[PDB]
Amino acid sequence: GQLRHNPLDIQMLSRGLHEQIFGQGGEMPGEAAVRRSVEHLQKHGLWGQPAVPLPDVELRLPPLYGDNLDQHFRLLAQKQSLPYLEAANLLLQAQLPPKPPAWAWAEGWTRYGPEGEAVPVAIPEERALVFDVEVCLAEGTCPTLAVAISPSAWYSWCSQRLVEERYSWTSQLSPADLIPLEQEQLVVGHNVSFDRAHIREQYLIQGSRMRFLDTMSMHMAISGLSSFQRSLWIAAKQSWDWLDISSVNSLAEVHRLYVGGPPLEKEPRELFVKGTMKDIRENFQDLMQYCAQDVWATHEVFQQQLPLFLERCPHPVTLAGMLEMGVSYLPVNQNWERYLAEAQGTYEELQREMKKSLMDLANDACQLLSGERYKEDPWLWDLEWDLQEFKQKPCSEEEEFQQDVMARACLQKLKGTTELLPKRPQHLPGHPGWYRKLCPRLDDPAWTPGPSLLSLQMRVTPKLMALTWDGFPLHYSERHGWGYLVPGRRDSYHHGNGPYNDVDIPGCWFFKLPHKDGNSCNVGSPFAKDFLPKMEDGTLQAGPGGASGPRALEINKMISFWRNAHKRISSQMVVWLPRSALPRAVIRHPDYDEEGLYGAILPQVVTAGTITRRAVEPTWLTASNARPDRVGSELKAMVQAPPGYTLVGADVDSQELWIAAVLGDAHFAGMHGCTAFGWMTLQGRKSRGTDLHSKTATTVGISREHAKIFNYGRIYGAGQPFAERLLMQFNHRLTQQEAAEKAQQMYAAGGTESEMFNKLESIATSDIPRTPVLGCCISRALEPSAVQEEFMTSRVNWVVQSSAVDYLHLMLVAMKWLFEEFAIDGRFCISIHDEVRYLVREEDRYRAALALQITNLLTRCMFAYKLGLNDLPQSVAFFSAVDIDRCLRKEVTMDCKTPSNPTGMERRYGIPQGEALDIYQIIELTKGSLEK
Amino acid sequence: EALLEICQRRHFLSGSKQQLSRDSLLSGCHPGFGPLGVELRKNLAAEWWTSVVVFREQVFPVDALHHKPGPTSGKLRENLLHGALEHYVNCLDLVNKRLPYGLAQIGVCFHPVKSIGEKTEASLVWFTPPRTSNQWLDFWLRHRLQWWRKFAMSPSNFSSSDCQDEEGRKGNKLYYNFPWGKELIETLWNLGDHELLHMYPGNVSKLHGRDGRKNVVPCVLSVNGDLDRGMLAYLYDSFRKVLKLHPCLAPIKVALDVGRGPTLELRQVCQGLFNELLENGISVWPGYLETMQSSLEQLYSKYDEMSILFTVLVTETTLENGLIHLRSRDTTMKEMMHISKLKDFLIKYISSA
Amino acid sequence: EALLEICQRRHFLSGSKQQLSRDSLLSGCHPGFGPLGVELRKNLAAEWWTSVVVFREQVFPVDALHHKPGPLSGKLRENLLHGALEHYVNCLDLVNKRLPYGLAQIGVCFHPVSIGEKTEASLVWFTPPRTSNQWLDFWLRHRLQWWRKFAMSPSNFSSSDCQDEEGRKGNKLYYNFPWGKELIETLWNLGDHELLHMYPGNVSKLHGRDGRKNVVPCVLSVNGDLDRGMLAYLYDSFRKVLKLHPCLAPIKVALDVGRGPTLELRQVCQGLFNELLENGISVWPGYLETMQSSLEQLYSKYDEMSILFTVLVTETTLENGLIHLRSRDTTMKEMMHISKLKDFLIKYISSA
DNA sequence: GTCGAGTCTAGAGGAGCC
DNA sequence: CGGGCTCCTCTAGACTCGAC
Ligand SMILES: Nc1ccn([C@H]2C[C@H](O)[C@@H](COP(=O)(O)OP(=O)(O)OP(=O)(O)O)O2)c(=O)n1
Ligand SMILES: [Ca+2]
């Protein structure tokens, strides 16, 4: 039979797969290790628990290349990244002639030979380049000019929109409006993701062999800094040994750190961020010179960085994954514009509804100026109520005509007394001080009558609404944030955040509003999401009463995300592919809309923007999922596959939990399930809802995402006060004593997680900390020889986070190999920190799902292999479910019903629900083979 | 009953408390509105016409007769749908048989109450292909609800409901939360081709519109709203006793007064300002022609109860420095502004409201 | 004859080619008005309101019902005078019992022929008997000037003085149609018979202040037919062309496209269309047409539709912004920048 | 030649993702 | 000792600059 077990009774991988992955034969765990494991599990009461075996899986995996799994992965990575390595070496040993004396003024690509000779060329025609693109921000998103460095000659590109001046261009971008480039080619840049988005051939649905390398990603890999470290570095520039070998991701700072020559020059006028097209056409030579200087600095930094990156990240899988993570593709259609319009319209309507009440309250409050009645209002007594003087230096036809003319002339004569008034108009002198601020001035192009510059986040809105906390008026203190005043000082029966005597308001005591993050933090707005339970409970009461306060908080929650994300989402660069640029499969598909527009969005991803080498993207890695209350939260659902294509992806189940558990198990006795924590991690299925996150969400009635936050905080150093604050925040039914009691029980430890902590501390305190799987070193600004004992939490979390990044790299390499080998027509779509989406054709969706399952199996086996273990439990061998959907969303079953899209995706956009498939269904549908 | 007392006193409504009960107002058997009520209803109709017809390349005005002749005595119309449906074939030629296109009309419909009640209704017969009929119905529901909410102090008092007809046809209804209860103000019905086929028996070739490259018989979408109940709802929403009507709906925009002597020259200044504001499209209340002198506070209260946006005051000092006094209803604050910059400020205030 | 065919084709008048006739149009029994005719009538009503009610402090709007209940078994209204007379006492409070004051309303009046609906513009003028004839002559002159203001041939808008059976002086305004002279407006000096009849006894309520003395006013009835005025202007405005006055013409600017590409030209035309709409200019969206016909045919179609100017957007607009601009009156073409079109149209309408 | 209104910037607090 | 990111709005402070 295919069933297998271990000394600790944990079900292991099926023999038909174990013989293919780990081979036959190996080293036995021994006897003392098993005795220690049995004693540990018996002390923790886990040895006697039985588990129902999972169905066995029999597959014919693709033929592995090397003698074992590590050699297989190394061969795959080397075959994937070989041409790009030689291109990088060509750039490394390049001989660059000096830049031409005069930059060319022509449309297209110009090649500058020796002595400044400019030649018109169609494409650069080079295997390796250093690239930088300049875009006139005022005009839009179309590129303006670009400078390309080659080992043989210089290159410069100028847009038609820069050379030619027209009344109006097309606001909808097209491939014919992008930079022409493009058997493997390498492009190197400081933010090459930004420069990738301006290449003509990077938006075709079918893939290409051009890859991109980044210098700030390599800077983060080699000698990067954390955000707190970035702030400290900036403060110090204006234990500290790490300052010398670290810098921020600015090109000037990176050049100073790695080259250290003359400081890089920056154009002070900023003619692309603050200027216009005429300024660029006037300062063409200077801007092109600055672009060339940036390209030269990037080339020098790349030369100084590549050997260091290869030394500190020697595994080819890291480079292959970074190359694959650079390419990202998000297809869209005409529904993207409709989503933008609907989200903006809903946001405007809700903003107007919010502003109407505040404007009415402000207008009604102006009547307190008459008679000095403001000095008795508990909310508006301390505002600015001053006034400003106005500074200063029948009838006949003939009779009616004459009367009208005389009246008009008298009116015209009066209008001519403008000489005595001051030139600069005064801004509402008659209104009180606090009312002028809320009103836009007449010269503002966005002027609106009334106090239109008013919002909940302002410091006067709580005073206008007369918010009250437990029968006491709200009061703002600059030192202590928002609070409330308890009358009766009579120079305290109420107990709260504390009787702060610093404020010293006569006849009252100042008590701070409770904050979700402790007494140290200060509340900046009583309209935050945390006070909605207090609004419903009646502790926080608005002056008008009724539902005005709760409605205010509800609308604030509805428009909070879009308020902070509308500029990012609306500014996304979308290039619409014409009919000739579309595959014939899309054209011939029934779903193809003839009048529709099909395009693509390329995320501007920094491959290694984290000290843990995680990717960072301003919009798509911060994109919220669809929710019933958030406006514009169906953002990711607008990434719709073209007619004839599907999005196949999966999410790794308990990634960091399993990585920490397997590290602890390998450190303890060399078997899966050796530790109590590792045994608990393995004993659980997501479909049955018995995993660690669900178990915690059942033990304490918080949501499963709240359980994720709780567990991950507890792992990485959160104390008991943090745990009890989280419990009180997420489960409002609890009290302080109940949260304190639940804190001890969930933190009851010679402990369940002792081995994991010991292993993580040992790896963190090593002279050169490295990833246990791929051997990637830590940043030079975090080694113990550079930081000593500081940043301990960051260092202990780095091991697991960089292990997850290695997991992502291995998944990308395996998926690329499987797609290339068996002719699976598809390409990598986007990878969130633990998700991997692939744009595959409709005909090959199940083959793609099988490839994903095989990739997950291989990655888990590699993780087990590198730590000393020679087997893999069947529970973690495959994805719980693989999504096959036409759009991108957290779950295939959900319909994105939001305030912007209340009818749902099926009704408004005609997107049917997808399917989530386990390994067995994929095997049944594919007959177990990846062939066609 | 304070609002109705103000409306009678400020000539929004005609009659007495006997003819102006809630049932009489909601039924259409009341006497006609006052001049201020007529102006408010005209502003509401103008806003509706702008939003529904002006910024639409396919919505055209239609003229439906007040009576339906023949089968022998005729009858007074009870809905505007029939007359607009009678013009579908003729109006197809305007859009060259392209769909969707709509016919809009504002008129008086006679509803039996036997007493005959007159209601001013605004119609929009929206011919659409059957493929996107539900999407168009939802779009028009959202559009009309936003239109009703954007002139309201409390938009939450305007709500919507989903309803089905006797034949199961989908539709929607709009309501305003009056102090006594919610009353219907607008009704959208997603009719099919039943009325079109019944009104044009025979070949359906004449009824074929173009959905892209496909000929199809359209599904009739009818939107019918109550302008009288709409303005009554806005009067209740607006209601120191002040009717805070929207600047785009207030019947009279500016009240123009005068201070002390000299009388003769200030009358000329006021008349010139009156003519200027009239030629610029601003409705003015000539308070300078009233011989019955009243205190400034009483005049302010009277203007506030009349939904007067601004009270322009021309005094003796205006002749020597050109400054005029402007009190706003919203804030009750007095501002001194130059006379040359009054018209532009008022136009900006009205347009940007 | 040909003018009626043009109005039927260009959607000035609704109905079939046989359902419309001269007698039906004059009587009010025609099937109705097309969208262009509706807009022309709306422009006429707006001009009448501006000339009568807007620029006078004594004239107020009235709200008269279409039906008069009670014993006279209700009946549809035949005149707009009775509602104003019923509102006389209450509307006398707004002016603080000052005289003169007026009440004006535009509405549909029903006359037996069948039922003939005519939209009539009415003004009632409450004056003391001392200045009745002076105000009657004043209103006669003003109304004749208003009718002649929009006419290419104001000689056809005649006038006449007539005496009724009772013996009350009144005037009648006429238009010279190609078949004869048809009444378009009539003024009367009714006196105080109706006001006393509808308010029997207690004449103290009907008193009005003629300065120092309280006077029972004399009512002046100014009644004109806007539909008949619309027909008169259509006949006056008529190479087949309908040279309607710019303040009355239903559609002012025609916006078209000349060549490819479709998307950019469509966007430019949509922006110009939105701007012209926001600036109160009526535009005919002719750029939506799937198959553009000959430019001569479009010009003829827009001439028959009383459109002031035609704007043609081509590739040159994208490059230089210059747009073709044809004038309906002078049939002359010119090219002007697209940023100055709105101001040009506004100034042209103001000058008209 | 003084001074009160634009303009830029740094900091605090809040809010999306993994 | 949760960690790693990302961006935003609002407010106070310093600097600048045109007009009286
Ligand atoms: N508050 C958080 C959220 C996430 N992560 C890290 C740990 C996870 O391994 C990784 C992926 O996040 P998920 O939300 O996907 O967590 P899981 O993969 O454990 O959940 P699931 O099993 O639902 O995928 O991100 C973290 O450290 N702290
Ligand atoms: Ca996960």
Numbering used by the authors:
A (entry chain A): 67 to 248, 262 to 317, 344 to 498, 532 to 629, 731 to 988, 1051 to 1233
B (entry chain B): 67 to 137, 177 to 218, 229 to 354, 369 to 482
C (entry chain C): 67 to 138, 178 to 218, 230 to 354, 369 to 482
Task: Reproduce text from the manuscript describing this model.
Mammalian mitochondrial DNA (mtDNA) is replicated by DNA polymerase γ (POLγ), a heterotrimeric complex consisting of a catalytic POLγA subunit and two accessory POLγB subunits. In addition to its C-terminal DNA polymerase domain, POLγA also contains an N-terminal 3′–5′ exonuclease domain that is crucial for proofreading during mtDNA synthesis. More than 300 mutations in POLG, the gene encoding the catalytic subunit, have been linked to severe, progressive conditions with high rates of morbidity and mortality, for which no treatment exists. Here we report on the discovery and characterization of PZL-A, a first-in-class small-molecule activator of mtDNA synthesis that is capable of restoring function to the most common mutant variants of POLγ.
Wild-type POLγ produced full-length, double-stranded products of 7.2 kb in less than 15 min, whereas mutant forms of the enzyme (R232H, A467T, W748S and G848S mutants) only produced a smear of shorter products and did not synthesize the full template. Although the present study focuses on disease-causing mutations, our initial screen also revealed that our compound can stimulate wild-type POLγ in vitro. The A467T and G848S mutations are both located at positions that are distinct from the catalytic sites of POLγ, and structural comparisons revealed that they do not affect the general architecture of the enzyme.
